[PDB]
């Protein structure tokens with residue numbers, strides 16, 4: 035499939051140690067399996083096993099997630115296609131760590147990416163590297179919005195109130211596309227401007243949370259990079275390729291209809307991915323804002339990836355199984371024997 039579904043388990047953490055929680059998740063990257071202990075202390079043997087396209091255990095470094103998951107997708111984006119990577123899972127399991135990452139406790143400027151850097155900085159690093167290394171005329175722009183309770187908020191506009199809702203227009207160029215009027219798109223001339231853009235977005239997220247209770251754990255974040263590529267033929271024709279990569283940090287998978295329409299928006303996304311995997315005619319793109327925004331990138335002739343993030347702690351057994359169930363319903367991968 036052009037649809038890859040992978041699972042990442044993060045290390046057991048302090049908040050989980052506090053509660054005398056036990057470790058219940060075992061990852062087998064070679065067999066691409068996740069086994070979860072299902073019986074608690076009274077039955078430590080019973081387990082439930084899932085199989086995915088890739089499995090990343092607690093020791094997985096950021097660079098290996100990038101190389102395994104993003105590199106093939108970025109290669110297609112650079113050929114002029116529109117792709118999407120999602121991070122899905124319970125709050126606190128590592129969607130933002132995977133999507134954004136963290137920087138060095140030492141502030142010194144380096145050109146290599148931080149070992150803790152996530153998909154977003156690494157993607158921008160490789161875009162500028164790949165395209166400078168082969169002499170292509172190119173420009174890069176990025177946008178960052180937040181979907182909270184089915185409403186769209188611009189996280190990068192320097193000059194508008196973050197609480198101003200954004201409207202979606204039809205796109206006369208493409209029946210699959212949408213134009214988000216007023217969405218700030220910032221040109222990136224060098225790999226480092228990305229870090230300043232992520233800081234601006236983080237400040238806007240805090241304001242949105244203070245103003246509207248639009249907490250990032252309850253919102254879908256959509257970081258979109260658009261690469262505009264130009265080559266001039268021998269006889270002087272300018273050919274334009276346009277690649278787009280959407281890096282989506284979904285709302286936590288765990289009010290009411292605030293929380294309800296979170297679950298419905300995520301279920302709609304799940305139904306879209308399942309229909310794309312099964313090649314069924316009815317893909318419900320139009321039934322949520324998230325899938326409307328991403329419809330032009332999800333069509334079928336592109337690579338899509340879902341990184342399902344989970345906790346290894348007994349405290350989160352129910353949501354871990356719910357996340358694995360969601361990932362398995364998105365793409366039915368059967369268990370091998372022995």
Ligand SMILES: Nc1ncnc2c1ncn2[C@@H]1O[C@H](COP(=O)(O)OP(=O)(O)O)[C@@H](O)[C@H]1O
Nearest residue numbers: 043044045124125126127128129130131132251
């Ligand atoms: N693979 C990992 N290794 C080390 N720390 C992690 C990992 N994944 C998540 N964390 C840490 O766990 C905390 C919660 O992760 P976060 O990305 O905020 O979860 P989410 O975005 O899914 O709510 C953060 O402090 C983050 O640094």
Ligand SMILES: [Mg+2]
Nearest residue numbers: 129130250251
């Ligand atoms: Mg997060």
